[PDB]
Design a protein around this ligand. Structure first.
Ligand SMILES: OC[C@H]1O[C@@H](O)[C@H](O)[C@@H](O)[C@@H]1O
Ligand SMILES: OC[C@H]1O[C@@H](O)[C@H](O)[C@@H](O)[C@@H]1O
Ligand SMILES: OC[C@H]1O[C@@H](O)[C@H](O)[C@@H](O)[C@@H]1O
Ligand SMILES: OC[C@H]1O[C@@H](O)[C@H](O)[C@@H](O)[C@@H]1O
Ligand SMILES: OC[C@H]1O[C@H](O)[C@H](O)[C@@H](O)[C@@H]1O
Ligand SMILES: OC[C@H]1O[C@H](O)[C@H](O)[C@@H](O)[C@@H]1O
Ligand SMILES: OC[C@H]1O[C@H](O)[C@H](O)[C@@H](O)[C@@H]1O
Ligand SMILES: OC[C@H]1O[C@H](O)[C@H](O)[C@@H](O)[C@@H]1O
Ligand SMILES: OC[C@H]1O[C@H](O)[C@H](O)[C@@H](O)[C@@H]1O
Ligand SMILES: OC[C@H]1O[C@H](O)[C@H](O)[C@@H](O)[C@@H]1O
Ligand SMILES: [Ca+2]
Ligand SMILES: [Mg+2]
Ligand SMILES: [Mg+2]
Ligand SMILES: [Mg+2]
Ligand SMILES: [Mg+2]
Ligand SMILES: [Mg+2]
Ligand SMILES: [Mg+2]
Ligand SMILES: [Mg+2]
Ligand SMILES: [Mg+2]
Length: 1059
């Protein structure tokens, strides 16, 4: 028999327990209901509430029967409404037939209401900080708002409602213009305009451009208080135009643009339907606006971002607090040189991404079902047999499933008092007879291994000696958090690892103990890190951690304290160790890889994963992975598998994984198992193509990884991060930038083969075939199930590790300590420069520069000193000569000859690439290609109308030519860029006309001319005629038509634009 009421229950944001107070934190005028339970269900029960208001005893409130469920009766007691300042203390009671009264409480709540800033009464400039003394709209406080500069382009606001706290110092490079009506604070990067009566702030760039501004009606800034000693929430409100887009907020699965939504900064473990529930494991109170600023609310407490979700021109943040009136509101308005610089400034505040070793950027293999040595050996054997040179290996089902630090089937003498084991304490049996040997075999295969972990000590009520000993010790030492009553905090019963005891990662002694138990795994077994899963496990209002903080503040921070603790520990022992986690908040980026969690194998999930990666990126979490093609649900289709593979190969971290622990047939998301499950053998060569291409691009990818760590530029970015002004880039969620120079457009729709790609300003070249696409429009790209549209930005310099075949998608292996043929792929356009991170040769920075001068038929490359032979692949027409330091280098007629030569050049007519080989020298080398023009615009890649392509006459450039083009209504249209601005140019038209002289009609931006194409000796002989054209800057429409007055058949190879 009993009674129970607990006002906050588990303090879950989304649900309530059936015995809570509603509202949990009452405001003035809100009716207060107490939900109370009794058991068993029995006639003769009475439930009531004994209480005081401002210390005065009130008449008891009688509860009314609500409903019965299970062994319990539920009741509601109505306390009524209260006024601001009221302090209510109550005890709930239940009895049967006037007998033993069971009770809960006392519980106290302080009734609140909002107070807002009114006017600025005085301004004090302290040199490194500005104090604005203010009045309030209500109450007796004298608030102070402190302004400071984290940097000249990053403004910090700290609000003390009572005026008793002081803000932090910042930079002193600012000036102030203080007048009776307004104060303007200026730096070389910002102009902050503050109206004094009423108080209202606008943040502008130095030149005056508005970044954001507090809502028009002012009184925008406020706090929720009882007017005495409780401050429970803060808010500010801002004006936003109807076109403003909001990105980031951590990792989001529903949309990349949060306009219209209430975004909760609240970590949560939501399985499979993250998009639909709008939940996430990784929540960060930071967003980037395409209006060129970021806003970071510096608090671990839950916050709600109302992004034009209430009023169409208003966005707001509402930040919770634990009552403590000394906790100031602290937020930043972040400007920068560009959107990526904004993110860099954010990482100055919350932490830089820690550069991971290069092995982290190869393929990771994982499957929950791998649970014994024979599974590992078969996994390694299958990878080798299928030519899959992975670099990472994950084991989840490796332990006793009890302590999570002892190998499954290991036997030993149990240890008391939390003593740590060493490798020699164990007798290894059954599934794992030689863990050290097993790790040695993984290392032998060129891979590194990580082991799965959780931050909780399991307690499912079953007896298990070592786990029981550990629990006893942990409790005696206070290594758990406190439930608020002196007992250890346990995960709520109905949750993942319910009843388990969380390790208090804020407790250094606790962390030292916990990690000591895993030490032998790094020092003796030789593992390369941990897959630190979970962490979204902190509930309860009164839950208390060693640092004095409670559940409200610690829920979002806990996962990152957990993940960082393990990352640092593993790395302290093994410098090459890497963590792989799913949960966190601001700062998560300092500590390893984050994967998108648990999703099903559908295209809808794929779409959600892509959004999660793009949002995480904006939020500073660059080293992001996902379970490619999904880890659970029905096995993926061959189509999904192939589409997922392609995106994954061009994502920051590439990893396959599966959920099932012991299925039949296998659930592995490996390519060999995908072939087995779907019956589609073509999956293997398609997977190989993408894996091999990723490894060819590893120098570029790893340099990008370094750029994240040093400069805050995420590896994979939503289009508006690079092009914030471009109205077509705002909502794109099915394409992205990868590194600085690649535009990747995965197909994420079932059945799709015509893929739309928005190309921003500039020229974009298909990296697979050399097709040229002018920017500033949406193109349609035909992509079969094996094809991924990827384009290089104009001026791009891309380092690659190539085989002697020199094609993308050729297996170079997984050697991370040497290159095969280090190659630089170059798309000349003006003057371009790239800093290559040569990690193979000591991490030296190699500064490469390219100067395009097609106006004079030259492209120059300034190659710095290199440790290795270097191959340039320059997109251009064929040179008449190539020089290195002024000396001619020999033309190689075939690829074989080029490979045998120590220096020389070779022209690839199919890709329109000039290969140039330079010897390794401890001095810079000046390479010049002479007689070159911009690469041809291949006819077979133009817009074709009623005409087809062929390859059945030798001598063409590209993949072939347009065949015949000999009837009315047949057309070939080109999108041609003016190589050097608006001007006249010469257009070369390369064709064959074996039978007789021909004519075609050409329109240049609608201006017609007829061209004569004289007969060639035969269809195996090509000729080129020069046509004068006038081009405008940018894209030019060049249409070749066969009109009524034209004549004869031709084969049409390409066109070249030149001076
Ligand atoms: O002291 C008075 C209280 O005693 C209980 O036994 C009654 O059932 C309550 O409704 C009442 O408020
Ligand atoms: O074993 C007694 C249990 O009975 C249930 O009906 C109650 O709701 C539980 O809180 C209680 O612990
Ligand atoms: O827009 C800000 C407002 O949001 C509402 O949802 C909250 O309940 C209010 O307390 C707050 O003033
Ligand atoms: O299959 C693994 C999944 O199982 C679910 O029951 C848990 O809540 C998730 O945290 C976990 O990733
Ligand atoms: O209100 C329905 C019922 O509620 C509780 O079970 C009471 O003990 C009982 O006397 C009453 O009949
Ligand atoms: O096998 C290791 C772990 O992997 C799985 O993801 C399960 O969620 C967990 O219950 C299990 O203990
Ligand atoms: O029921 C849980 C048990 O599962 C397996 O037998 C594990 O090998 C063992 O360590 C664990 O106690
Ligand atoms: O910890 C539970 C048990 O695990 C292993 O089976 C040990 O060999 C045994 O001594 C111990 O009691
Ligand atoms: O990039 C050049 C061409 O590449 C492929 O052939 C695509 O199917 C096509 O749409 C594109 O225009
Ligand atoms: O009529 C034009 C055609 O003439 C010949 O048949 C050629 O073989 C063919 O390549 C060309 O397209
Ligand atoms: Ca051609
Ligand atoms: Mg009665
Ligand atoms: Mg959509
Ligand atoms: Mg900066
Ligand atoms: Mg198995
Ligand atoms: Mg080692
Ligand atoms: Mg303690
Ligand atoms: Mg120039
Ligand atoms: Mg060689």
């Amino acid at each position: 028999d009993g009674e129970y009421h607990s006002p906050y229950g588990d303090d879950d944001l989304y649900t309530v327990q059936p015995t809570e107070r509603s509202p949990r934190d009452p405001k003035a005028g809100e009716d207060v209901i107490l939900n109370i339970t009794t058991w068993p269900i029995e006639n003769g029960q009475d439930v009531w509430v004994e209480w005081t208001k401002n210390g005065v005893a009130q008449e008891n409130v009688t509860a009314a029967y609500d409903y019965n469920s299970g062994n319990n009766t539920y009741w509601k007691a109505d306390l009524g409404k209260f006024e601001k300042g009221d302090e209510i203390t109550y005890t709930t009671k239940g009895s049967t037939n006037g007998g033993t009264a069971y009770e809960s409480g006392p519980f106290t709540f302080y009734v609140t209401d909002w107070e807002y800033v009114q006017d600025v009464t005085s301004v004090v400039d302290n040199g490194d900080s500005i104090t604005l003394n203010m009045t309030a709209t209500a109450g007796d406080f004298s608030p102070k708002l402190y302004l400071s500069f984290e940097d000249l382009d990053t403004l910090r606001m700290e609000l003390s409602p009572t005026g008793k706290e002081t803000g932090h110092a910042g930079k002193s490079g600012y000036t102030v213009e203080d007048t009776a009506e307004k104060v303007t604070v200026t730096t070389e990067d910002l102009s902050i305009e503050i109206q004094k009566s009423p108080y209202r702030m606008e943040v502008h760039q130095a030149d005056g451009t508005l970044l954001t501004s507090e809502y028009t009606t002012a009184n925008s800034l406020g706090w929720l208080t009882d007017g005495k000693n409780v401050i429970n929430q803060y808010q500010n409100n801002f004006m936003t135009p109807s076109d403003e887009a909001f990105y980031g907020f951590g990792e989001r699965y529903d949309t990349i643009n949060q306009r219209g939504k209430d975004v909760e900064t609240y970590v949560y473990n939501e399985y499979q339907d993250q998009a639909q529930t709008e939940r996430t494991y990784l929540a960060v109170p930071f967003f980037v606006s395409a209006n060129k600023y970021g806003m970071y609310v510096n608090s671990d407490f839950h916050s709600q971002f109302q992004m034009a979700s209430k009023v169409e021109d208003k966005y707001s943040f509402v930040l919770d607090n634990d009552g403590d009136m000394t906790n100031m509101l602290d937020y930043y308005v972040i400007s920068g040189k560009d959107q990526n610089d904004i993110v860099n400034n954010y990482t100055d505040i919350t932490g830089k991404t820690t550069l991971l070793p290069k092995w982290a950027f190869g393929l990771w293999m994982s499957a929950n079902e791998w649970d014994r040595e024979s599974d590992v050996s078969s996994a390694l054997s299958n990878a080798k047999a299928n030519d899959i040179p992975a670099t990472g290996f994950v084991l989840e089902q490796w332990s006793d499933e009890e302590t999570y630090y002892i190998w499954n089937n290991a036997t030993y003498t149990a240890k008391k008092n939390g003593e740590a084991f060493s490798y020699d304490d164990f007798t290894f049996n059954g599934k794992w007879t030689d863990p050290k040997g097993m790790v040695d075999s993984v290392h032998d295969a060129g891979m590194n291994i990580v082991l799965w972990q959780v931050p909780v000590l399991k307690d499912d009520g079953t007896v298990y000696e070592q786990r029981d000993n550990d629990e006893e010790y942990m409790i005696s030492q206070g290594y758990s958090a406190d439930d608020g009553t002196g007992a250890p905090y346990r995960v709520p019963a109905s949750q993942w690892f319910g009843n388990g005891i969380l390790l208090d990662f804020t407790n250094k002694d606790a962390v030292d103990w916990w990690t000591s138990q895993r030490e032998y795994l790094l020092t003796e077994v030789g593992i390369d890190g941990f897959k630190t899963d979970g962490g979204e496990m902190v509930w309860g209002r009164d839950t208390t951690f060693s640092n004095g903080e409670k559940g409200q503040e610690m829920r979002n921070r806990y996962p990152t304290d957990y993940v960082s603790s393990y990352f640092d520990f593993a790395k302290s022992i093994n410098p090459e160790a890497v963590s792989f986690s799913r949960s966190g908040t601001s700062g998560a980026q300092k500590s390893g890889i984050y994967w998108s969690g648990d999703q099903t194998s559908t295209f809808d999930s794929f779409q959600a994963s892509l959004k999660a990666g793009l949002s995480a990126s904006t939020s500073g979490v660059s080293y992001w992975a996902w379970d490619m093609a999904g880890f659970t649900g029905d096995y993926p289709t061959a189509e999904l598998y192939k589409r997922a593979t392609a995106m994954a190969a061009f994502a920051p971290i590439m990893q396959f994984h599966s959920e099932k622990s012991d299925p039949s047939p296998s659930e592995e998301r490996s390519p060999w198992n995908a072939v087995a499950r779907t019956g589609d053998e073509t999956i293997l060569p398609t997977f190989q193509k993408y894996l091999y291409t990723r490894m060819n691009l590893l120098p570029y990818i790893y340099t990008a990884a370094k750029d994240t760590a040093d400069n805050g530029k995420s590896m994979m970015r939503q289009m508006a991060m690079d092009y914030p002004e471009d109205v077509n880039a705002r909502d794109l969620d099915e394409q992205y930038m990868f590194g600085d120079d690649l535009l990747v457009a995965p197909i994420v729709q079932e059945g799709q083969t015509e893929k739309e790609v928005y190309l921003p300003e500039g020229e974009w070249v298909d990296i697979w075939n050399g097709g040229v696409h002018p920017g500033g429009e949406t193109i349609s790209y035909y992509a079969d199930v094996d094809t991924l549209p990827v384009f290089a930005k104009a001026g791009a310099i891309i380092p690659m590790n190539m085989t002697d075949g020199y094609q993308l998608g050729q297996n170079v292996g997984n050697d991370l300590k040497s290159y095969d043929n280090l190659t630089f792929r170059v798309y000349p356009s003006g003057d371009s420069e790239y800093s290559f991170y040569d990690d193979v040769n000591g991490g030296e920075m190699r500064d490469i520069s390219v100067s395009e001068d097609f106006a004079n038929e030259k492209v120059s490359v300034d190659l710095p000193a290199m440790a290795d032979e270097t191959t340039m692949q320059v997109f251009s027409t064929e040179p008449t000569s190539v020089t290195i330091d002024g000396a001619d280098v020999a033309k190689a007629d075939t690829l074989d000859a080029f490979n045998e030569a120590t220096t020389g050049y070779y022209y690839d007519t199919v890709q329109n690439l000039t290969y140039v080989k330079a010897a390794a020298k401890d001095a810079k080398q000046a390479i010049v290609l002479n007689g070159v023009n911009h690469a041809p615009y291949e006819a077979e890649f133009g817009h074709l109308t009623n005409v087809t392509t062929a390859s059945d006459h030798a001598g063409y450039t590209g993949t072939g030519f347009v065949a015949g083009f000999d009837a009315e209504k047949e057309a070939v249209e080109f999108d041609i860029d003016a190589v050097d601005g608006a001007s006249d140019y010469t257009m070369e038209v390369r064709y064959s006309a074996g039978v007789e002289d021909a004519t075609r009609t050409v329109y240049i931006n609608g201006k017609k001319q007829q061209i004569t194409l004289p007969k060639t000796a035969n269809w195996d002989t090509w000729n080129t005629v020069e046509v004068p054209v006038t081009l405008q800057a940018g894209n030019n429409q060049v249409v070749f038509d066969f009109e009524a007055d034209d004549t004869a058949g031709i084969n049409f190879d390409h066109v070249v634009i030149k001076k």
